[PDB]
Design a protein around this ligand. Structure first.
Ligand SMILES: CC(=O)Nc1ccccc1C(=O)NN
Ligand SMILES: CC(=O)Nc1ccccc1C(=O)NN
Ligand SMILES: [Zn+2]
Ligand SMILES: [Zn+2]
Ligand SMILES: [Zn+2]
Ligand SMILES: [Zn+2]
Lengths: 360, 360
């Protein structure tokens, strides 16, 4: 069986399980099941499945070097697929809620879920809640007797919580820290003093890297009973590194990738986000460039947004991006080597994860 | 130590733990810790703690009839307090998200969290996410080596998921089921055919009873290692019963309790909710009363809202409420008796829970 065919098959299995359970146990009616089925499909399907398929790829790597009965290979692959779907549904939860929080319009060339006419914000907030709740149902059902259940649920919780804290760091990145106050409406920074590489790194570490890279790699190790083939501090190090690079690419595309190709209209400039471009720009700008940036950033006026894109465009940020890229290539290749001391297999999966990231 | 003093003390402990953890492990800064501290206080504190204190009361009941070392009594009481706070934070999550979903204004005489000037919807959605995430952190930290950890986390998940499904039943209660469709903007019912006692019961079972009554009673049993002193089917039966009664009281107050005493302006009529009053009214109305209700319900116009309150007011719904009340008294007293076959203690705690409900 090709990996993706298996993974998609398991989607249909898990869907059927969750919807059947809602009928036998939760008194649901056919029509509300249908709404939830459509919600699931709409929010979970249509991506590349990178996160979920990484769990499967990591487990296939170990299968090739470990002795097992055929039924045990099938159980491991089925558990890798379940776990990969947990991650995909977790991502779905955050995309639905983020889209609502950020007033987003489109995602992937289609309207955000909350914007569907028969959804609305009132239902979509709860739909997003349900998406994450289904991750737990999956785990307690498919993994009920498994040795790794405890470790997987603990890992998933820590990853979820890091991700929520990263959303907080992200949405507050354009405020001055010393002015955060629930009682007082929050003004945009005027000094941009908190637009630094270290602050940027913290936002991205927490908002994306844990769920996108750490969790799929560690989940693959757990369903394989292979956590002893790695040094976990190295797996954390390489996940945070590759994950940062991924987000830098995403920041640059928000600004410069045509909307029809990006799948949405990028608004990081108007939203005053602490993006890689803003930080890198401030890190090399002269005084008049910093002042022009300040007069124009975080405004909806398209003329000001164009002034920002022009400043970025003339500041030779491609050079800074290639220098960054070169350094990440260098460091990820060193970590991959440190990962061979214990597992060629796992180091190769990390290599594949890097290749898929680097060359998109 | 009085129970409430202990419970409040443990709040301060748990708060300190979560905020310290955010500093040592999650790279938080003092200012964002302070925002989260204020958020926690604002959303978790200020109620009666009924839910959390039930866990403590149930565990105190068992302590009085079970032999233990004093350190073991202290550990049980501390675990009951932690678990009670998990429930209180879970309720906080749902109140924050519900308030956003329903466009609520006030809760308990203060603005809803999302309406604070330095919060907004963008941050409050995520704050609510964090509230529930903190329930998990509590459990994995305080209960890490406890025998009941697995059973508690499984119970809490099922309760959370039931509650989300109940929010779905609630927010869609005024739509015709056969017209639910994410693609099509949802019209209000015109026939009210789905405003039935059985449909009402399903909404309330799921939206309130599991977290308000089932979970505190079962959590008390689990931290006490006492689940064998009960027949779980009876504990489910009595929790769903008392919980329904609680929600009927809440529905009647939304309509008839003065705003300054209710702590908010009740809008169930304007929101077209499937309330006890609407259902009970339709269950006795003549044809002209049903038609007047239909012409007036689910509208913001205060004159129409007054027409609805007038219809309810002339339909002798107090009689139906006393008849309901009498039947619930009767049935809960029968269940309490069935609960003595195994535990006087637990049956008394259920009695107290009922007294606190019935006489508010
Ligand atoms: C078209 C494109 O992909 N990028 C740019 C265009 C204009 C200015 C800067 C960049 C850039 O990448 N900066 N790092
Ligand atoms: C003042 C009050 O608490 N209740 C009513 C007032 C007017 C009409 C009906 C009721 C009622 O309770 N119905 N069950
Ligand atoms: Zn966002
Ligand atoms: Zn982006
Ligand atoms: Zn609501
Ligand atoms: Zn109410």
């Amino acid at each position: 069986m090709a990996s993706m065919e298996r993974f998609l098959s398991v989607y249909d299995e898990v869907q059927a399980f969750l919807l059947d359970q809602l009928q036998s146990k939760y008194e649901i009616d056919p029509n509300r099941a249908r709404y939830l089925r459509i919600m699931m499909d709409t929010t979970c399907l249509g991506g590349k499945y990178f996160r979920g398929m990484t769990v499967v790829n990591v487990a296939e790597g170990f299968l090739a070097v470990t002795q097992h009965d055929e039924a045990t290979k099938e159980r491991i692959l089925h558990d890798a697929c379940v776990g990969g779907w947990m991650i995909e549904f977790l991502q779905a939860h955050y995309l639905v809620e983020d889209d609502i929080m950020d007033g987003s319009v489109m995602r992937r060339g289609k309207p955000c879920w909350y914007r569907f006419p028969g959804v609305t914000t009132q239902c979509a907030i709860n739909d997003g809640i349900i998406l994450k709740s289904w991750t737990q149902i999956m785990a307690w059902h498919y993994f009920a007797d498994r040795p790794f259940l405890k470790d997987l649920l603990c890992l998933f919780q820590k990853v979820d919580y890091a991700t929520a804290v990263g959303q907080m760091y992200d949405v507050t990145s354009m405020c001055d820290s010393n002015k955060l106050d629930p009682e007082v409406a929050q003004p945009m920074t005027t000094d941009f003093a908190e637009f630094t590489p270290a602050i940027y790194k913290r936002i991205v570490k927490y908002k994306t890297t844990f769920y996108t890279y750490l969790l799929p790699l560690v989940m693959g190790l757990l369903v394989s009973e292979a956590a002893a083939s790695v040094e976990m501090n190295l797996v954390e190090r390489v996940a945070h590194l590759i994950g940062e690079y991924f987000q830098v690419q995403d920041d640059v595309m928000d600004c410069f990738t045509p909307p029809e190709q990006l799948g949405k209209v990028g608004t990081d400039i108007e939203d005053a986000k602490c993006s890689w471009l803003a930080v890198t720009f401030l890190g090399k700008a002269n005084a008049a460039q910093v002042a022009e940036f300040k007069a124009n950033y975080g405004e909806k006026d398209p003329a000001k947004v164009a002034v920002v894109k022009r400043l970025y465009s003339k500041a030779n940020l491609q050079a800074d991006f290639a220098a960054y890229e070169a350094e990440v290539v260098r460091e990820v290749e060193s970590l991959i080597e440190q990962l061979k001391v214990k597992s060629p297999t796992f180091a190769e999966s990390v290599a594949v994860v890097w290749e898929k990231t680097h060359k998109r």
